[PDB]
Amino acid sequence: GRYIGPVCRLCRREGVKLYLKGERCYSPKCAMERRPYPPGQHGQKRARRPSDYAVRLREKQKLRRIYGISERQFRNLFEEASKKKGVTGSVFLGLLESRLDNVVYRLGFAVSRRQARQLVRHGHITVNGRRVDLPSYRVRPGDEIAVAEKSRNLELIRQNLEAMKGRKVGPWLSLDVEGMKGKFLRLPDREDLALPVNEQLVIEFYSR
Amino acid sequence: DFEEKMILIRRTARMQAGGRRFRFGALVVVGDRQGRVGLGFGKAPEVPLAVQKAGYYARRNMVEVPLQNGTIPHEIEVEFGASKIVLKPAAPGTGVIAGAVPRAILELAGVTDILTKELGSRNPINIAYATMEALRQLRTKADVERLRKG
Amino acid sequence: MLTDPIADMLTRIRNATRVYKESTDVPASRFKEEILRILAREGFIKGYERVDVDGKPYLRVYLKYGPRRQGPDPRPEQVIHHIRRISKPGRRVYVGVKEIPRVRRGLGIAILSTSKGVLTDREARKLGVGGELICEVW
Amino acid sequence: VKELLEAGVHFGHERKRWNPKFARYIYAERNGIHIIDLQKTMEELERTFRFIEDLAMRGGTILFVGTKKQAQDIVRMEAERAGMPYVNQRWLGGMLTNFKTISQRVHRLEELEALFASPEIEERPKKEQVRLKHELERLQKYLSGFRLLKRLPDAIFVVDPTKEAIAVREARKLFIPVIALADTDSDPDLVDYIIPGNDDAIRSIQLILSRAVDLIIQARGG
RNA sequence: GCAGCCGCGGUAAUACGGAGGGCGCGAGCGUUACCCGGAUUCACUGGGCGUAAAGGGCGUGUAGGCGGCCUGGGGCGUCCCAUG
RNA sequence: GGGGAGCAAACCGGAUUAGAUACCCGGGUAGUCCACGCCCUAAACGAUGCGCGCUAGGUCUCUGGGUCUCCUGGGGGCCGAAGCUAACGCGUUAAGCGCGCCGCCUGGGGAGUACGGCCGCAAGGCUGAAACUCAAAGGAAUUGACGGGGGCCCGCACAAGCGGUGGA
Numbered sequence A: 001g002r003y004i005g006p007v008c009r010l011c012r013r014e015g016v017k018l019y020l021k022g023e024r025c026y027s028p029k030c031a032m033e034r035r036p037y038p039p040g041q042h043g044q045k046r047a048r049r050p051s052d053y054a055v056r057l058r059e060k061q062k063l064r065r066i067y068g069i070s071e072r073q074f075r076n077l078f079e080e081a082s083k084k085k086g087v088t089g090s091v092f093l094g095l096l097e098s099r100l101d102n103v104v105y106r107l108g109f110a111v112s113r114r115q116a117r118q119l120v121r122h123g124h125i126t127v128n129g130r131r132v133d134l135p136s137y138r139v140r141p142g143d144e145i146a147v148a149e150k151s152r153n154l155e156l157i158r159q160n161l162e163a164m165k166g167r168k169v170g171p172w173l174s175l176d177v178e179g180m181k182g183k184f185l186r187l188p189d190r191e192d193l194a195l196p197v198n199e200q201l202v203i204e205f206y207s208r
Numbered sequence B: 001d002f003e004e005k006m007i008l009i010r011r012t013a014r015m016q017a018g019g020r021r022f023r024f025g026a027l028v029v030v031g032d033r034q035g036r037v038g039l040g041f042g043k044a045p046e047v048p049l050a051v052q053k054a055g056y057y058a059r060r061n062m063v064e065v066p067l068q069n070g071t072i073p074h075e076i077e078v079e080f081g082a083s084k085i086v087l088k089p090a091a092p093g094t095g096v097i098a099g100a101v102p103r104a105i106l107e108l109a110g111v112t113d114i115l116t117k118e119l120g121s122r123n124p125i126n127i128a129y130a131t132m133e134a135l136r137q138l139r140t141k142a143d144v145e146r147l148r149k150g
Numbered sequence C: 001m002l003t004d005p006i007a008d009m010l011t012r013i014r015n016a017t018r019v020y021k022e023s024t025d026v027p028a029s030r031f032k033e034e035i036l037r038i039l040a041r042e043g044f045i046k047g048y049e050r051v052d053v054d055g056k057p058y059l060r061v062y063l064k065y066g067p068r069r070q071g072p073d074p075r076p077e078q079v080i081h082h083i084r085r086i087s088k089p090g091r092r093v094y095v096g097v098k099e100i101p102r103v104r105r106g107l108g109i110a111i112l113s114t115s116k117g118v119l120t121d122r123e124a125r126k127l128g129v130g131g132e133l134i135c136e137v138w
Numbered sequence D: 001v002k003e004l005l006e007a008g009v010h011f012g013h014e015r016k017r018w019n020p021k022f023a024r025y026i027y028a029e030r031n032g033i034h035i036i037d038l039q040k041t042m043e044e045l046e047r048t049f050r051f052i053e054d055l056a057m058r059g060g061t062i063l064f065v066g067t068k069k070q071a072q073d074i075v076r077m078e079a080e081r082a083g084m085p086y087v088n089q090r091w092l093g094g095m096l097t098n099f100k101t102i103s104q105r106v107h108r109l110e111e112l113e114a115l116f117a118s119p120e121i122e123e124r125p126k127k128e129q130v131r132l133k134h135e136l137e138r139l140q141k142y143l144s145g146f147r148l149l150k151r152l153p154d155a156i157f158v159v160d161p162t163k164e165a166i167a168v169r170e171a172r173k174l175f176i177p178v179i180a181l182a183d184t185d186s187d188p189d190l191v192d193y194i195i196p197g198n199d200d201a202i203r204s205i206q207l208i209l210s211r212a213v214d215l216i217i218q219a220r221g222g
Numbered sequence E: 001g002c003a004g005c006c007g008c009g010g011u012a013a014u015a016c017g018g019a020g021g022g023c024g025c026g027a028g029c030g031u032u033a034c035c036c037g038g039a040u041u042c043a044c045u046g047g048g049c050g051u052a053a054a055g056g057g058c059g060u061g062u063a064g065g066c067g068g069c070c071u072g073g074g075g076c077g078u079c080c081c082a083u084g
Numbered sequence F: 001g002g003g004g005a006g007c008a009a010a011c012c013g014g015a016u017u018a019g020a021u022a023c024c025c026g027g028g029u030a031g032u033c034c035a036c037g038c039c040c041u042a043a044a045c046g047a048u049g050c051g052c053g054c055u056a057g058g059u060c061u062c063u064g065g066g067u068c069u070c071c072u073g074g075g076g077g078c079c080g081a082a083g084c085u086a087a088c089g090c091g092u093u094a095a096g097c098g099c100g101c102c103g104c105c106u107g108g109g110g111a112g113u114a115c116g117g118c119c120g121c122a123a124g125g126c127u128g129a130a131a132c133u134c135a136a137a138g139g140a141a142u143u144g145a146c147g148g149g150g151g152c153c154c155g156c157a158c159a160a161g162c163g164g165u166g167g168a
């Protein structure tokens, strides 16, 4: 059970916009537009001061839910990130942003993160030449993450790239829309990320 | 400017004939995320009021804190009669590692990664008080040179 | 009986500063002399001269303090906050060079006694030796 | 001005009730009395007076306080003679830690002074009359000098420090300089600028302040 | 009836039982049992003994532990190098 | 084994009391005194192991040396710097800053018991658990109430007084 249930509800739990559905979470409706209160029968109620724990918590989740990844991997990552020489936080987002499924999203070969998954599990994705269905896969720098010849004439993908002529790609990424390709340049830097989170809290959380 | 943070509040009892007239206790931490951190013990008959009181107190007992790349320039253990506190500097990426109280105090000190540990009696009050005289002691490589000169 | 010399010394030192005396006496002895030798060159104290008290040899260790504080209790920061014997008698502690300790993120100092003589952690390491780690002081 | 070797005045004061720390400041015992090394006192003065001069010409204020019975009348005099605030009668707990709360009493004096000049005097109860008349009386006792305090003083000239340790304690915590005509019984460790000297002797306090206030004046230029 | 602990329940239960809702985790989640941990609560790191539990009712001295200043020999402990 | 004035467990009576196998009164044996031998515990208490060095003084006092209206050594007290302590408190007679070395503690109750061994003439003692069971037991201080504790002060509260109810 890798989640998959009511979504732009979490956009609502956190109180920060969670780009979980893409188009639409741009139309007046990631719900945060016009209904910022959290879910539940008590959403509209005055909220008490959140224990240190609470914030440390809620902020872990914010990270997590964005990438939509079962705690088990998420925590695993964070573990693998503690073992690397670096800033225990920045490196976290490192692998976090290096997952095949994410890449595709940033490459624009998909409306949303979720969508990207399917694209991967269904195998519409080339990676340095061969297809790949395992999203959790880690895209090394200098890999041609692309689309299967087979998938190119797709009503979805097509309509997506059409949009790309008009949006810059992440600074650590390249792509040749014309040929529907794209390369992973180098691990993105914290300064390069946009995310409305505070790693520090996340780290701080994993020491309880 | 200054960010008020609430350590804790307790309600106390003073006795009298036929009643237990109460009294409220507030503890606040105040600072810049730069390096000045106040700390007050505000007592009053009404909480919002005690809080408001503690506020005043803290803004006065501030402590300039040396700040090498986010951490504390050198370890230190400080006994506060009861509670003792270990303060130990660490590398970026390690994040504050203490509890409620010392966090609250360090957090506002702008301390970013650091290694705590509470020992002996774990009395918020004291612990806090300790984490203060704790910080108050820290001295820079510079500050020390200046100290043994001539 | 006087069971540990150095120990006494350190304590006379410690015990004097705390009350704020200018200088304090102390039984002389080549060794004790080499420790005081360090302190002053390390700057924890002014210095020390050999002396005779009613016929006996003594070492006048001259104390060093900080400036007069402001506000209440203008008791000057002490140049020597901390000072304790590490290796005591009946629990002697010798260290290997690898094992030499870094003191107060290297703000304090450590003094051992190597076969190449009485030294500072820094010196020792620069010197590639180890020995009886006499004391912490910062 | 600078003043002689007028030893015909503060040679020594207290028996053996002294304060060890005061050791540096004494010459010897004679008939069971500590006698203050004057050659030294001179070295102190040369400093203490150096300080005040700095204050005076810099245009600061110095609060004179001495509650001792002897100095009583002389405090009043000297401060009066100087452009200064003094505490003659009694020292109130907080004329510095709690200045703002005290200054409010001043205002009371200010506000009562008025009514004892306006028409609204007898015109209104006579029970209150006295009830107010009294309030003035008392105010014009304690705050008689304290009135000149617009804000906190740049320094405190204390007479007998160990007696006023409160007033010192205060100053000490607000970072305000402390000057004192101290002797055997004091703890020099807390006087920013001391002046080792006999004090119960009217001739002592009378001289120490004279030359002190004289100095203050010649410093401002009048 | 709940319950790890403090406790909750005698007609107004955020603590029982159901429901709506919510949090957490997901082919899993709970429970029990056992290890280390928190516990510097056996304390080498890193504890104590006036009243909190703790000085032996006192002395005597056996084994043992511990020991003053200067100079030299030996170098066992101890430190450094190489090597297996 | 000797001794025995006074005192006095137990025990005999007396009064007190709802009762008194007690507190009060009168008697009284062991015992209490001595010698020899055993017992060996204790609020055997500074409730504070022994020894050495170091850290402001003031004052009272025992005692010794000195050129003795002051100095200097040793002991017993009270107040007190720095410091320490949970706090009371401690403070050169350390509960301060240090080294040596010994002893002892490790939740309460169950237990100073059980079991085992040692010792003793016996009474007993030394050593000394656990099962079970409880979430405390515990120190010092605070504010209160309270004391058949204290000091002081009030009210037709008592006294002093007049007049009444309780009877019909």
Ligand SMILES: [Zn+2]
Pocket: A007, A008, A009, A011, A018, A020, A021, A024, A025, A029, A030, A031
């Ligand atoms: Zn949405």
